[PDB]
């Protein structure tokens, strides 16, 4: 069964915009989004549709690029490290749930390298 998706806005959580958060949305997220391997990561894992009944029995901190995008659009993060942490959570969840050699893991690995490539240099303040 599917849990509620991660929140994308919270009235108790303070919002912020930085030059690095604008970078992560405009170039990092939006370039990754257009990659040929992006499609499995553009929305939360639908355990019912994908016939993965154990996915949320294993993954207790789910994360996907659609949630990250909405969070960036809503100024949900305080800084860039908070957003990068969500990207790393998405990738690690995929390696936790699946095994080396799986097609999904090969796709995740390709996207992680491109992500690291792009966050290697970020803008300044
Ligand atoms: C292999 C199952 C899996 C997916 C995934 N399988 C998908 C199949 C179809 C779609 N579609 C979405 C809407 O457009 C039409 C096609 C999205 C999918 N995402 N993602 C992740 C992170 C995993 C893991 C780690 O097990």
From Swiss-Prot:
Gene of this entry: BRD4
Record protein name field: Bromodomain-containing protein 4
Purpose of the protein: Chromatin reader protein that recognizes and binds acetylated histones and plays a key role in transmission of epigenetic memory across cell divisions and transcription regulation. Remains associated with acetylated chromatin throughout the entire cell cycle and provides epigenetic memory for postmitotic G1 gene transcription by preserving acetylated chromatin status and maintaining high-order chromatin structure. During interphase, plays a key role in regulating the transcription of signal-inducible genes by associating with the P-TEFb complex and recruiting it to promoters.
Organism: Homo sapiens
Domain Bromo: 16-122
Further facts: JQ1, a thieno-triazolo-1,4-diazepine derivative, and I-BET, a benzodiazepine derivative, have been tested on tumors with success. Treatment with GSK1210151A (I-BET151, a I-BET derivative) has strong effets on mixed lineage leukemia and promotes myeloid differentiation and leukemia stem-cell depletion.
Site note Acetylated histone binding, residues: 98
Tissue and organ distribution: Ubiquitously expressed.
Processing after translation: Phosphorylation by CK2 disrupt the intramolecular binding between the bromo domain 2 and the NPS region and promotes binding between the NPS and the BID regions, leading to activate the protein and promote binding to acetylated histones. In absence of phosphorylation, BRD4 does not localize to p53/TP53 target gene promoters, phosphorylation promoting recruitment to p53/TP53 target promoters.
């Amino acid at each position: 069964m599917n849990p509620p998706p991660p929140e994308t806005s919270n009235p108790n959580k303070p919002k912020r915009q930085t030059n690095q958060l604008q970078y992560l949305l405009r170039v990092v997220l939006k370039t990754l989004w257009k990659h040929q391997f992006a499609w499995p990561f553009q929305q939360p894992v639908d355990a019912v549709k994908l016939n993965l009944p154990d996915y949320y029995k294993i993954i207790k901190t789910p994360m996907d690029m659609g949630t990250i995008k909405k969070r960036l659009e809503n100024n949900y993060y305080w800084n860039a490290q908070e957003c990068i942490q969500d990207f790393n959570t998405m990738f690690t969840n995929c390696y936790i749930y699946n095994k080396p050699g799986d097609d999904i893991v090969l796709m995740a690995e390709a996207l992680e390298k491109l992500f690291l490539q792009k966050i290697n240099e970020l803008p300044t303040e």
